[PDB]
Amino acid sequence: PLLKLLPLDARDRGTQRCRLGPAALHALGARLGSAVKISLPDGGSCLCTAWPRRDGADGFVQLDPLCASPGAAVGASRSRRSLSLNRLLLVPCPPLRRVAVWPVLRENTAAVLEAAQELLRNRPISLGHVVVAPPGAPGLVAALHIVGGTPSPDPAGLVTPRTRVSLGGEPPEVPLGGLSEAADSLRELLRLPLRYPRALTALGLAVPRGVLLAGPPGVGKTQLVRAVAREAGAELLAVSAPALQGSRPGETEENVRRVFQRARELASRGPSLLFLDEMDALCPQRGSRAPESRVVAQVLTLLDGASGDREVVVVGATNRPDALDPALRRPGRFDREVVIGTPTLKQRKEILQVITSKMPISSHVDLGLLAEMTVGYVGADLTALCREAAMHALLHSEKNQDNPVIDEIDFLEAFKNIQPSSFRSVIGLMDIKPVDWEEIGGLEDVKLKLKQSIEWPLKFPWEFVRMGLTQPKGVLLYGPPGCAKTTLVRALATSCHCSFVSVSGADLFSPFVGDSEKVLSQIFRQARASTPAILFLDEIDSILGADVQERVLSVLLNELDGVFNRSVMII
């Protein structure tokens, strides 16, 4: 005989009551309140008490799962499954003398023990079962796991007001490559404020607590912090807030201090991280609203406050790194920066090999040609290129549907109608192509003078200073157009094996560059960050404006002066 399943009423919610008809109670031979074990259709089982329906009609079953197998709360009845009667059993309940529970508490020992006695008072329970607290219950225990008992609750049993309750305990995604170089630069900072049970209170200070991530829009900045997240616990209150303000002056400064209040509340025995995103915050035509960045300043001040109290790490991600507040950048709230650049030719192949691994693409597909043809893209557009080449190989297809053959015909078809991302052709580009010294014909004496003033002072620094020779603090090369000045600088960077920050004048003509005093300060800071380095300013007459003229000269003249191997050469 088959019985239907119906959703429970508002009076059976959290009462552990099973509503049966009279013929099923005659067939089971049960009294009122006797224990019925229900073997569920989608695995697992539950334990309930038998109570009759008011209507007297037979053919229907309702059930409320409170004592359940873990992950077996499948008693929702949208599809209206039917249960057979062979799945309900009448189970004898001896009384118990000792239980063993493991509690799951909400976000001392005596209050937890008192809340366990109060939940489990006069109930039938079995072994390996979760007892779930009803909604609106007083106290702090959210769940209990049943571990053991001395009259052995394997065919279950009844807790009594005079039983004993004891506490034991035994509870038995895209990897994204290409950011490997910067993923561990993050850990050499943030691992030391994750192994802190007030040990750095005892011996030390506090490495910074205020990091900043920058990069082009599409290199996967938000997914990197979720990867460093899971990597070391943490609940990442990822407060984005692109428009959290309003018409009132600073009405969300009360709101962000409650955001910052639960940074402390969720700081006991566990890591936490405040993840401010899109600190972009557009540029209003008129003066930005006071509350907009004042609270920032509050966030600033608040942040600088986090130093006199319990110290919570803040990782911020912005898109365009310049035109921030200059009172951030000073030692404190925000002084350690990790820069994620546009991808090179090398790991763009390993960007592609991560995405190619999940899809069934056949072995007759190039990678180096797919890396080389895709110059100008970011990591978001390479996923959509591999999304679109899956679609035109499902779009057009055959009738067999057993061999997923994706070939080079529809990768080149999907290359055609995907537009490339902007905000790449700017700032400064390292890595270009290797040029040897033998490609430049003639000019033997100019090669000797360039070697004696920039490569010998950056490669052999002890023998330069012991012989008593000065380092020239910035050279200038001038001549007619067409006599290999840019080739001689690029041959010098290959033999030096150093970083190469190059700014040209044709980079500066783009309208996406914001006013270029702070692009010129961004170039000097990325240089002093990367160590032994060559800063190349090609076409300085276009940079200096052959007003904004006098302001540019000034940011340049002040940086040219204020500056075991160091120093930045300016060519």
Binding site: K4, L6, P7, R80
Partner: peptide, 26 residues
């Protein structure tokens, strides 16, 4: 059906009831 929403009387006419066992009326 009759309900008084803050003094205003409402007249409701029931056209169709669909219940928990899936059987509808006319």
């Amino acid at each position: 059906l009759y309900c008084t929403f803050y003094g205003r009387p409402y007249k409701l006419q029931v056209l169709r009831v669909k219940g928990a066992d899936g059987m509808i009326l006319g």
